[PDB]
Structure formats: structure tokens, C-alpha cells
């Protein structure tokens, strides 16, 4: 999608892995804010919103919560208190044809700069104030968006490249999504401190013949003590017997 008609995708209700994006060398122009880069997998969020737009090189600094340029203020304005953070990737060769190409459009003329996270698609041509054009292109009345010519050989920061912006917005509702985390191998016959899907304790985790229902995941003993737990990785039920603590 173009910058002014920036495409939005909701990736919520789904676990996404953030580490692979960091290990990518192509997505080198990584400048984002708020949550720590290592802390993406650590935290959970209610929503996962992705915005996408191609722009020139010099516009990397222009589009940010702190810095706002004319193209940044209007086409797509990041929130000042930006909880999500931006990813920028250089894609000059794929986007740009020989001697430039003409497929993307940027919008820069309007009376009012858009509020944060506002999409405007209207092609109504601005009349430059008092002079009414009533929908005809003239010296005062000009088309809101101008054709975007892009090539790596061009000048200071005119190289075209793609930008993807991740916004979390976890405040409203329970955090349905989480980053991948806490994967560890299994050991059976040894007193060990276990954490099986949030179940905290210490004991000997042995193989069990008795089975839960496909519904039920945990299991308690009489007097409300944990007795067996189904293994989340591979669906089988392992019984628990805490290791010996008899006196001497």
C-alpha cells in the first residue's frame, strides 16, 4: 500500500515471534521506542497492529513520535506517547525500477494535519483557502497528492524503502497475545523445581497411568494438593510426588 492510504492489519488473537525480526540483517534501519528490544517476547499485549508504507530515505527521521514532518504529520502521524515501535527496512532494488518508477503516491496538501493514527483517502483537491476552485485544478487549487519518483541513484535520502510499524495498545482489554517464552526440556526422575504452564512447585515428576479428560489440564489430590499435570508440549499426564524430606 501507499503511504497516504497506509494499510492496517490486526495480528491480535495470535502469538507472533519477535526475535526473528531482530535477527534479520535486511531490516537494519531499526529505530523504535518504548518497549525494550529484548522485552518484546517478555511482555503480553491486547492488540497487535501493523501499519505499512514505502517512503524515501530522508523520511526515516521525519516519521517518529518525537519528530514530525509535513509528510509525517499528515499521511500517518505516530502517537506522541508511542507504546508500539517502528521497524524500517531498505528495499531499494525491489521497489525501484531502472531510472525510477511511478507506482506509489504521497499526500502532502491539506488544511489540517491528521490526528494520530488517522487515514485519509479523499481525493478532494484543496482550494488553497478563500479562493474556491469547486473541484477544478488551478494555480490555487491543486491535487492533494503528488507523484512519487524514486531511485537509489537519486540524492540525499531519496532511496525508496518499505516501513512497517508495530503498535501494541494493550491498555483496553486483557492481553490475549504473548511473545514466545520459557521453553525447556523435560526430566522425569529427579527432585526438580518445575513450572508446567504456570504451575509452580518442586517435586519428582513421574510417568502416570491415570489420565485426565481431554478437557482437563491440571489435577489435584484430596485436600486440594497438586497430584498430576498434563504435559503441555506433548499431551500426556505426569504424576507428581515431592522428593523425600523425612527427618534423620
Amino acid at each position, epitope marked *: 500500500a501507499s503511504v497516504y492510504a497506509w494499510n492496517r492489519k490486526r495480528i491480535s488473537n495470535c502469538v507472533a515471534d519477535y526475535s526473528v525480526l531482530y535477527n534479520s540483517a535486511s531490516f537494519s534501519t531499526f529505530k523504535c521506542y518504548g518497549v525494550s528490544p529484548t522485552k518484546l517476547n517478555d511482555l503480553c499485549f491486547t492488540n497487535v497492529y501493523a501499519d505499512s508504507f514505502v517512503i524515501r530515505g530522508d523520511e526515516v527521521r521525519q516519521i517518529a513520535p518525537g519528530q514530525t514532518g509535513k509528510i509525517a504529520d499528515y499521511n500517518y502521524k505516530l502517537p506522541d506517547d508511542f507504546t508500539g515501535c517502528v521497524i524500517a527496512w531498505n528495499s531499494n532494488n525491489l521497489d525501484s525500477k531502472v531510472g525510477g518508477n*511511478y507506482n506509489y503516491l504521497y499526500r*502532502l496538501f491539506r488544511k489540517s494535519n491528521l490526528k494520530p493514527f488517522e487515514r485519509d483517502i479523499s481525493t478532494e*483537491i484543496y482550494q*488553497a*483557502g*478563500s*479562493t474556491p*476552485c*469547486n*473541484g*477544478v*485544478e*488551478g*494555480f*490555487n*487549487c*491543486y491535487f492533494p497528492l*503528488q*507523484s512519487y*519518483g524514486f531511485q537509489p541513484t*537519486n*540524492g540525499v535520502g*531519496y532511496q525508496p524503502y518499505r516501513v512497517v510499524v508495530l503498535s501494541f495498545e494493550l491498555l483496553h482489554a486483557p492481553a490475549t497475545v504473548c511473545g514466545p517464552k520459557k521453553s525447556t526440556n523435560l526430566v522425569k526422575n529427579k527432585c526438580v523445581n518445575f513450572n508446567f504452564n504456570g504451575l509452580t512447585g518442586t517435586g519428582v515428576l513421574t510417568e502416570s497411568n491415570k489420565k485426565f479428560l481431554p478437557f482437563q489440564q491440571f489435577g489435584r489430590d484430596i485436600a486440594d494438593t497438586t497430584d498430576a499435570v498434563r504435559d503441555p508440549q506433548t499431551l500426556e499426564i505426569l504424576d507428581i510426588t515431592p522428593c523425600s524430606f523425612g527427618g534423620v
Partner: antibody, heavy 112, light 111 residues
């Protein structure tokens, strides 16, 4: 898009002959088919502005005179009828879309 | 508005930058934005436009041309002046009703 314009004129003072600008590939609905004046010197100025969709015209107040700017969208052409003339007003008149990204070939107005 | 344009004849060699300036009668900054227009005309050719407004540039116009200004002071800048960059360059206004161009700004090949 191609602009056609007609044509060579031999008008005498006191008369006025309507100049035609055939639009061809013009959208004729959102590009003010503006009119400007080029003389046998540099001396450029903007003659008038028209709205193909609306119909109202904005004209320079210095020489409002009796220039008739009509959006004849049935033929998709504008028409210069600059009523009342003089030997001084002998210059080429150009018709161009919007600001003038693509002009017309121009007509030789020879008021003598 | 009456726009008078300073030096009206500059000589330019290949690849050499030059500035030909335009001073208006008053500030063109109405509505919070300038409304000057810049046109080039080869001898015997339909004069194309170089700028949308004070700063922008029409599509299909090479980026080697540029220029800007404020109020009643505007100017041009073309670092890569080539053979094609020899024409008559006019400046217009769009705030007050009498939209008027300028005089002459002849560019000639330096030798």
C-alpha cells in the same frame, strides 16, 4: 493527452472571433482550462480562469473588459471571445490545463 | 500583484548553478502558504510549469531544478544546468485577483 487549438486569425480592430481549444484526452471535469497571453516579447500574464465542472470564471481585474470565458463542455472546448479590441491587443493566446503543465499550440491574434 | 524579477539575464555554463530572483509587491504568504508559480519556455514551445507552489515541483520535471522563498522574496537553484536549461523563466502569483507573470530571465550558455 493532446491539446488542439485553432487558429490563425486575421481579425480587425473592433471585432472578436472565438478561439477554439479541442481537449481530446482531457478529463474536462477537474482541470481549470486556464488562458494566458504571450506577446512578441516576454510579457506574460494570465488572461483568465474557468471551471469546466462548475462554470464560473475568475478573470484579471486589470482587463476584465468583455472577455467571454465559456466552458463549452459539450465540445469540451473553451472559447476566447475577447470583445472590444485594438491594434495593441495583438498577441498569441495560450490555453493550458490547470497551472499549465501541458499548454496549447496557440493562436496568432493579429489585430491590425 | 506586480512581480518584478531581478537579474533578468544570467549566463550559465554546463553544470553551473545560478540564481534569478523574484520580488513581489507584498507578501504572498496568504493562508499560511506562498502561492508563486514558476514557468519555463523554450523559444517557440508551450511553457511547462516547474513548481506546484512555493516549494513543490510538478511531476515529470527533473529534480535538478529547485527553488524557494518567503513573503516577497523568491529564487531559483539549478546545480546541474544542461543544454536544455536555456529558456525564459517567469514567476507568477495566486493570492490577489490580478494573477501576473514577470518579465524576462534569459539564460545563455557561458563562454
Amino acid at each position: 493527452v493532446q491539446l488542439q487549438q485553432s487558429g490563425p486569425e486575421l481579425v480587425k480592430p473592433g471585432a472578436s472571433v472565438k478561439i477554439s481549444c479541442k481537449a481530446s484526452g482531457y478529463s474536462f471535469t477537474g482541470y481549470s482550462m486556464n488562458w494566458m497571453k504571450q506577446s512578441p516579447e516576454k510579457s506574460l500574464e494570465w488572461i483568465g480562469e474557468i471551471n469546466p465542472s462548475t462554470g464560473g470564471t475568475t478573470d484579471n481585474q486589470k482587463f476584465k473588459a468583455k472577455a467571454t470565458l465559456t466552458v463549452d463542455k459539450s465540445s469540451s472546448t473553451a472559447y476566447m471571445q475577447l470583445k472590444s479590441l485594438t491594434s495593441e491587443d495583438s498577441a498569441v493566446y495560450y490555453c493550458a490545463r490547470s497551472r499549465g503543465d501541458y499548454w496549447g499550440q496557440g493562436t496568432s491574434v493579429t489585430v491590425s | 500583484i506586480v512581480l518584478t524579477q531581478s537579474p533578468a539575464s544570467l549566463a550559465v555554463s554546463l553544470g553551473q548553478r545560478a540564481t534569478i530572483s523574484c520580488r513581489a509587491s507584498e507578501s504572498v504568504e496568504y493562508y499560511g502558504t506562498s502561492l508563486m508559480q514558476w514557468y519555463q519556455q523554450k523559444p517557440g514551445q508551450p511553457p511547462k510549469v516547474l513548481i506546484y507552489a512555493a516549494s513543490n515541483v510538478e511531476s515529470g520535471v527533473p529534480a535538478r531544478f529547485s527553488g524557494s522563498g518567503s513573503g516577497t522574496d523568491f529564487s531559483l537553484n539549478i546545480h546541474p544546468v544542461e543544454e536544455d536549461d536555456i529558456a525564459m523563466y517567469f514567476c507568477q502569483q495566486s493570492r490577489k485577483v490580478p494573477w501576473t507573470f514577470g518579465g524576462g530571465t534569459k539564460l545563455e550558455i557561458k563562454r
